[PDB]
Design an enzyme around this catalytic site. Structure first.
Site, PDB file in Angstrom:
ATOM      1  N   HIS A   1      41.034  47.320  48.329  1.00  0.00           N
ATOM      2  CA  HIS A   1      42.071  48.379  48.134  1.00  0.00           C
ATOM      3  C   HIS A   1      41.655  49.287  47.032  1.00  0.00           C
ATOM      4  O   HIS A   1      41.738  50.525  47.192  1.00  0.00           O
ATOM      5  CB  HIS A   1      43.437  47.772  47.782  1.00  0.00           C
ATOM      6  CG  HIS A   1      43.873  46.722  48.784  1.00  0.00           C
ATOM      7  ND1 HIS A   1      44.083  47.032  50.084  1.00  0.00           N
ATOM      8  CD2 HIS A   1      44.158  45.387  48.644  1.00  0.00           C
ATOM      9  CE1 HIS A   1      44.454  45.942  50.766  1.00  0.00           C
ATOM     10  NE2 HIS A   1      44.473  44.917  49.914  1.00  0.00           N
TER      11      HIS A   1
ATOM     12  N   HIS B   1      42.900  49.233  36.992  1.00  0.00           N
ATOM     13  CA  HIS B   1      42.294  49.730  38.210  1.00  0.00           C
ATOM     14  C   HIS B   1      42.716  51.164  38.315  1.00  0.00           C
ATOM     15  O   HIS B   1      43.491  51.672  37.462  1.00  0.00           O
ATOM     16  CB  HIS B   1      42.818  48.986  39.453  1.00  0.00           C
ATOM     17  CG  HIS B   1      44.310  49.061  39.547  1.00  0.00           C
ATOM     18  ND1 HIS B   1      45.117  48.225  38.868  1.00  0.00           N
ATOM     19  CD2 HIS B   1      45.121  49.948  40.215  1.00  0.00           C
ATOM     20  CE1 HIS B   1      46.407  48.533  39.132  1.00  0.00           C
ATOM     21  NE2 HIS B   1      46.417  49.619  39.947  1.00  0.00           N
TER      22      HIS B   1
ATOM     23  N   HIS C   1      43.622  54.607  41.235  1.00  0.00           N
ATOM     24  CA  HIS C   1      43.884  55.145  42.586  1.00  0.00           C
ATOM     25  C   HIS C   1      43.279  56.538  42.622  1.00  0.00           C
ATOM     26  O   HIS C   1      43.383  57.265  41.581  1.00  0.00           O
ATOM     27  CB  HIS C   1      45.389  55.254  42.841  1.00  0.00           C
ATOM     28  CG  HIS C   1      46.123  53.940  42.666  1.00  0.00           C
ATOM     29  ND1 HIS C   1      46.421  53.129  43.728  1.00  0.00           N
ATOM     30  CD2 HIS C   1      46.502  53.261  41.506  1.00  0.00           C
ATOM     31  CE1 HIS C   1      47.094  52.029  43.253  1.00  0.00           C
ATOM     32  NE2 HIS C   1      47.062  52.079  41.891  1.00  0.00           N
TER      33      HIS C   1
ATOM     34  N   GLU D   1      49.213  58.706  41.943  1.00  0.00           N
ATOM     35  CA  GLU D   1      50.415  58.143  42.518  1.00  0.00           C
ATOM     36  C   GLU D   1      51.643  58.864  41.949  1.00  0.00           C
ATOM     37  O   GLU D   1      52.398  59.473  42.686  1.00  0.00           O
ATOM     38  CB  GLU D   1      50.465  56.612  42.239  1.00  0.00           C
ATOM     39  CG  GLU D   1      49.237  55.947  42.908  1.00  0.00           C
ATOM     40  CD  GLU D   1      49.498  54.540  43.322  1.00  0.00           C
ATOM     41  OE1 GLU D   1      49.813  53.706  42.408  1.00  0.00           O
ATOM     42  OE2 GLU D   1      49.494  54.243  44.551  1.00  0.00           O
TER      43      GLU D   1
ATOM     44  N   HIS E   1      45.670  52.632  36.008  1.00  0.00           N
ATOM     45  CA  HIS E   1      46.781  51.732  35.699  1.00  0.00           C
ATOM     46  C   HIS E   1      46.288  50.592  34.873  1.00  0.00           C
ATOM     47  O   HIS E   1      45.410  49.812  35.346  1.00  0.00           O
ATOM     48  CB  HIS E   1      47.393  51.195  37.020  1.00  0.00           C
ATOM     49  CG  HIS E   1      48.152  52.271  37.748  1.00  0.00           C
ATOM     50  ND1 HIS E   1      48.466  52.220  39.110  1.00  0.00           N
ATOM     51  CD2 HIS E   1      48.664  53.451  37.260  1.00  0.00           C
ATOM     52  CE1 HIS E   1      49.159  53.357  39.429  1.00  0.00           C
ATOM     53  NE2 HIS E   1      49.293  54.108  38.314  1.00  0.00           N
TER      54      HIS E   1
ATOM     55  N   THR F   1      53.097  49.538  43.002  1.00  0.00           N
ATOM     56  CA  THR F   1      52.938  50.587  44.016  1.00  0.00           C
ATOM     57  C   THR F   1      52.164  50.169  45.272  1.00  0.00           C
ATOM     58  O   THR F   1      51.908  51.020  46.148  1.00  0.00           O
ATOM     59  CB  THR F   1      52.173  51.799  43.437  1.00  0.00           C
ATOM     60  OG1 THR F   1      50.818  51.383  43.153  1.00  0.00           O
ATOM     61  CG2 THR F   1      52.875  52.352  42.181  1.00  0.00           C
TER      62      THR F   1
HETATM   63  N1  LIG Z   1      49.146  49.719  41.483  1.00  0.00           N
HETATM   64  S1  LIG Z   1      49.858  48.453  40.589  1.00  0.00           S
HETATM   65  O1  LIG Z   1      49.500  48.624  39.096  1.00  0.00           O
HETATM   66  O2  LIG Z   1      51.347  48.567  40.764  1.00  0.00           O
HETATM   67  C1  LIG Z   1      49.508  46.841  41.286  1.00  0.00           C
HETATM   68  C2  LIG Z   1      50.083  46.543  42.499  1.00  0.00           C
HETATM   69  F1  LIG Z   1      50.754  47.499  43.173  1.00  0.00           F
HETATM   70  C3  LIG Z   1      49.933  45.306  43.095  1.00  0.00           C
HETATM   71  F2  LIG Z   1      50.541  45.085  44.301  1.00  0.00           F
HETATM   72  C4  LIG Z   1      49.178  44.306  42.481  1.00  0.00           C
HETATM   73  S2  LIG Z   1      49.113  42.774  43.431  1.00  0.00           S
HETATM   74  O3  LIG Z   1      48.278  41.750  42.664  1.00  0.00           O
HETATM   75  O4  LIG Z   1      50.528  42.216  43.425  1.00  0.00           O
HETATM   76  C5  LIG Z   1      48.392  43.002  45.076  1.00  0.00           C
HETATM   77  C6  LIG Z   1      46.906  43.434  44.959  1.00  0.00           C
HETATM   78  O5  LIG Z   1      46.531  44.091  43.765  1.00  0.00           O
HETATM   79  C7  LIG Z   1      48.578  44.576  41.239  1.00  0.00           C
HETATM   80  N2  LIG Z   1      47.756  43.629  40.527  1.00  0.00           N
HETATM   81  C8  LIG Z   1      48.115  43.201  39.218  1.00  0.00           C
HETATM   82  C9  LIG Z   1      49.633  43.182  39.063  1.00  0.00           C
HETATM   83  C10 LIG Z   1      50.344  42.159  39.962  1.00  0.00           C
HETATM   84  C11 LIG Z   1      50.302  40.737  39.377  1.00  0.00           C
HETATM   85  C12 LIG Z   1      49.975  40.542  37.899  1.00  0.00           C
HETATM   86  C13 LIG Z   1      48.531  40.136  37.660  1.00  0.00           C
HETATM   87  C14 LIG Z   1      47.596  41.366  37.557  1.00  0.00           C
HETATM   88  C15 LIG Z   1      47.401  41.880  38.975  1.00  0.00           C
HETATM   89  C16 LIG Z   1      48.761  45.835  40.661  1.00  0.00           C
HETATM   90  F3  LIG Z   1      48.166  46.100  39.506  1.00  0.00           F
HETATM   91 ZN   LIG Z   2      47.921  50.831  40.548  1.00  0.00          ZN
END
Ligand SMILES: NS(=O)(=O)c1c(F)c(F)c(S(=O)(=O)CCO)c(NC2CCCCCCC2)c1F
Ligand SMILES: [Zn+2]
Length: 257
Positions: A61, A91, A93, A103, A116, A195
């Site tokens: 992703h 990470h 986007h 976003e 982010h 998101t």
């Molecule tokens: N774009 S974001 O910052 O909101 C986001 C997500 F949207 C999200 F779905 C995830 S996820 O792990 O639930 C699915 C694949 O990335 C993460 N990853 C982080 C935040 C979620 C859990 C906390 C541990 C760090 C991973 C995540 F960072």
């Molecule tokens: Zn993000």
């Protein structure tokens, strides 16, 4: 199954993740004339001097740069936050063109990308517990525009061709995320959600006003990454952003002016 294409993109997420249409979804458009300055916001405290990066991972992703969060080394505090949030990963986007990719939007303006920096609330003991809570995460969002190179990003850009495809990872130690910050920490803040699926409503969003600049060559290297795994048809990793969602019953607060 979920992704960013016509058949599995943001318009489809609600069928697996009903919360997609919930009351505090992210991202949002930040209307700069409706956001109100909040004089009770404490200053923001980004303490990244002890940050220990470990690894970079293409997750199909985006790519994640992961940190050791087994103790309080790199934390976000202050601003709208109560308590202490630990940096776990960052990470981005980004878009297929420079005119889209972020976003959040600012008065409907889209930036080329958005960083982010993800932090979890240490009173919940682990991040899996934190995502089940309305104040479990704090995500610091930073816009990227294309112009002069960001020296602090080049180590990231350099390693991307070693994680071209889904599920590839590489050692990524001693990276200093302070090199990705703008000069000012003026910000907007509002309650929202992850998101991407699972779209959990567990995020305090803190979105910096000042974008960082990255070069066209730097962002071009993000767009060489692949969504697919090795030995599969190449699908370039671009446009991995969710569009703005309805603000509903939320106020966006400004830390400034
Ligand atoms: N774009 S974001 O910052 O909101 C986001 C997500 F949207 C999200 F779905 C995830 S996820 O792990 O639930 C699915 C694949 O990335 C993460 N990853 C982080 C935040 C979620 C859990 C906390 C541990 C760090 C991973 C995540 F960072
Ligand atoms: Zn993000």
């Amino acid at each position: 199954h979920w992704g960013y294409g016509k058949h599995n993109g943001p318009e489809h997420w609600h069928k697996d993740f009903p919360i997609a249409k919930g009351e505090r979804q992210s991202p949002v458009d930040i209307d700069t004339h409706t956001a109100k300055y909040d004089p009770s916001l404490k200053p923001l405290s980004v303490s990244y001097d002890q940050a220990t990066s470990l690894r970079i991972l293409n997750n199909g992703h985006a790519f994640n740069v992961e940190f050791d969060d087994s103790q309080d080394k790199a934390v976000l505090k202050g601003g709208p936050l109560d308590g202490t949030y630990r940096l776990i990963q960052f990470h981005f986007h980004w878009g297929s063109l420079d005119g889209q990719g972020s976003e959040h939007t600012v008065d409907k303006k889209k930036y080329a990308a958005e960083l982010h920096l993800v932090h979890w609330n240490t009173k919940y003991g682990d991040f899996g517990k934190a995502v089940q809570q309305p104040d479990g995460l704090a995500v610091l969002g930073i816009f990227l525009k294309v112009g002069s190179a960001k020296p602090g990003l080049q180590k990231v850009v350099d390693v991307l061709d070693s994680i071209k495809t889904k599920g590839k990872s590489a050692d990524f130690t001693n990276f200093d995320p302070r090199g990705l910050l703008p000069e000012s920490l003026d910000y907007w803040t509002y309650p929202g959600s992850l998101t991407t699926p699972p779209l959990l409503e567990c995020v305090t969003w803190i979105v910096l006003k000042e974008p960082i600049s990255v070069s066209s060559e730097q962002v071009l290297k993000f767009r060489k990454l692949n969504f697919n795994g090795e030995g599969e048809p190449e699908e370039l990793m671009v446009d991995n952003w969710r569009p703005a969602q309805p603000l509903k019953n939320r106020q966006i607060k400004a830390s400034f002016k």
